[PDB]
Enzyme design. Structure first.
Site, PDB file in Angstrom:
ATOM      1  CG  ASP A   8      -1.994   1.006   1.113  1.00 35.39           C
ATOM      2  OD1 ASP A   8      -2.927   0.857   1.892  1.00 35.39           O
ATOM      3  OD2 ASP A   8      -1.975   1.993   0.419  1.00 35.39           O
ATOM      4  N   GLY A   9       0.262   2.067  -0.784  1.00 36.83           N
ATOM      5  CA  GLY A   9       1.251   3.336  -0.589  1.00 36.83           C
ATOM      6  C   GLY A   9       0.320   4.569  -0.834  1.00 36.83           C
ATOM      7  CD  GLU A  46      -2.613   4.046  -5.339  1.00 35.82           C
ATOM      8  OE1 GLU A  46      -3.608   4.714  -4.594  1.00 35.82           O
ATOM      9  OE2 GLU A  46      -3.419   3.443  -6.176  1.00 35.82           O
ATOM     10  CG  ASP A  68      -6.263  -0.428  -0.730  1.00 31.82           C
ATOM     11  OD1 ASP A  68      -5.037  -0.251  -0.550  1.00 31.82           O
ATOM     12  OD2 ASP A  68      -6.906   0.787  -0.540  1.00 31.82           O
ATOM     13  CG  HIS A 106      -7.088  -1.272   5.236  1.00 37.24           C
ATOM     14  ND1 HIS A 106      -6.777  -0.260   5.787  1.00 37.24           N
ATOM     15  CD2 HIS A 106      -6.924  -1.132   3.724  1.00 37.24           C
ATOM     16  CE1 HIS A 106      -6.020   0.437   4.957  1.00 37.24           C
ATOM     17  NE2 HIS A 106      -5.996  -0.266   3.904  1.00 37.24           N
ATOM     18  CG  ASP A 116      -3.740   2.800   5.057  1.00 37.51           C
ATOM     19  OD1 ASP A 116      -2.942   3.448   4.053  1.00 37.51           O
ATOM     20  OD2 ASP A 116      -4.134   2.786   5.532  1.00 37.51           O
TER      21      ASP A 116
END
Lengths: 133, 133, 150, 146
Positions: A8-9, A46, A68, A106, A116
């Site tokens: 996640d980013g 991301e 995600d 999540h 995250d």
């Protein structure tokens, strides 16, 4: 040879400081990676998260990468922006058999919730420059 | 006899102080080369970087040369600076050179290092790019 | 649904201008084509010839593909394709295997079919191979395309 | 009330474009179904083939479904469906399609026949050809792809 990667980013601004989080799990063991950048974007983080998670795997592996990322989801489900990172991703995927899993948030994905968290924490005290931004 | 060469050249103006950086990686070993010029161009430094990187080879070798030069890419994927083009042909002749025109420095760590060398050399030029023709 | 395919690729330099020729012969029917590239290699043209020959097939077929490519011969008589995938397409040194773009394309082009390679030891007794070689060499002298993946 | 269904599916890459073929034959009359997907896997196409073949039925029927799928054979012989989390608490894999197969089978009395290969199973050889042909011109997204 079944490895799981959760990435996640995100960026706090648009642009603004950002960060990524990557969690690798193999045979019950876990390694975590995170990094913060002074000026970047949601999309770049991301993508960077997936790139770095894959690069952390030294030997060829069968990978299930969960994220995600809407940016990656659309890109994989459908000049080009962020071509520098797209190329880096293709190169990072090269030695592995990567199966992407684009999850819905999540809920039911504890490792992604944690990735995250790592990204956000790294974004609060960034020092590295996103050289390609 | 396989060698990897990562090159980068740049200039602060057109013309302006500029420099090049070249990194050669053999089995284990690594050699780096950099030089700065008082008055030159991006195109000429990009070419000079490849030339000096190749001239460093002391015996015939299979070479994979990675560079982001649009100038070089257009020329090889398809006159200004004849002196340098001539030197490049002569520098490649003894080798089997496969160019790789990269889209960015991410996923190309050595290219980022080569860029660092070129930029650092440009801040302290001591040589004359006489040929700036 | 049986088809014979004769292919050949060559280059004038390493690297240098190159080209390929492909001839497909179905019951009575025949298709031929060729193309030259400005900067490529002998190995890449040999692989490209097989790739394009197979890509011309419009439906699944039982294929006998005739080529003298030593590159393909070594790869298939030793099963390098499976060996490479197993090692993540990295050489014994850890570097990426060359021409993976074309090897991948070949695997894709072969997938719908039942392919049997015939690595010929000459152009005699297989006129089509002599013709394919002629086509490839003429294309190398008249390059009109870029071998992008190179 | 008896219907014979022959299914097969494959992918040209892993992942790669793929397709499925399903042939239904009842007292003679024959219907076939095929579709190609842009990015999928062999396992998914073998599963999709059985799913769509069953979905082709319009009324409850007694079904004899023939397929050479090692993926399906293993899952059914070892009672995987009856057995959704792996032994180590990991997501199943292609659970979206396994769920689809369970639903597709529900209205019928399905008897599976997992065959070795095409030899002696001409309908399965034809289904394989249909699947391969569909994979050569894929236009559909296999969304669940996992």
């Amino acid at each position: 040879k079944q490895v799981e990667i959760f990435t996640d980013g995100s960026a706090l601004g648009n642009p603004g400081p950002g960060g990524y989080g990557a969690i690798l799990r193999y045979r019950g063991r876990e390694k975590t990676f995170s990094a913060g950048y002074t000026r970047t974007t949601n999309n770049r983080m991301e993508l960077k998260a997936a790139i770095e998670g894959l690069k952390a795997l030294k030997e060829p592996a069968e990978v299930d990468l969960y994220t995600d990322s809407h940016y990656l989801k659309k890109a994989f489900t459908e000049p080009v922006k962020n071509r520098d990172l797209w190329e880096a991703l293709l190169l990072a995927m090269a030695p592995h058999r990567v199966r992407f899993h684009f999850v819905k948030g999540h809920a039911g994905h504890p490792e992604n919730e944690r990735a995250d968290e790592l990204a956000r924490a790294a974004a609060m005290n960034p020092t590295l420059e996103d050289t390609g931004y």
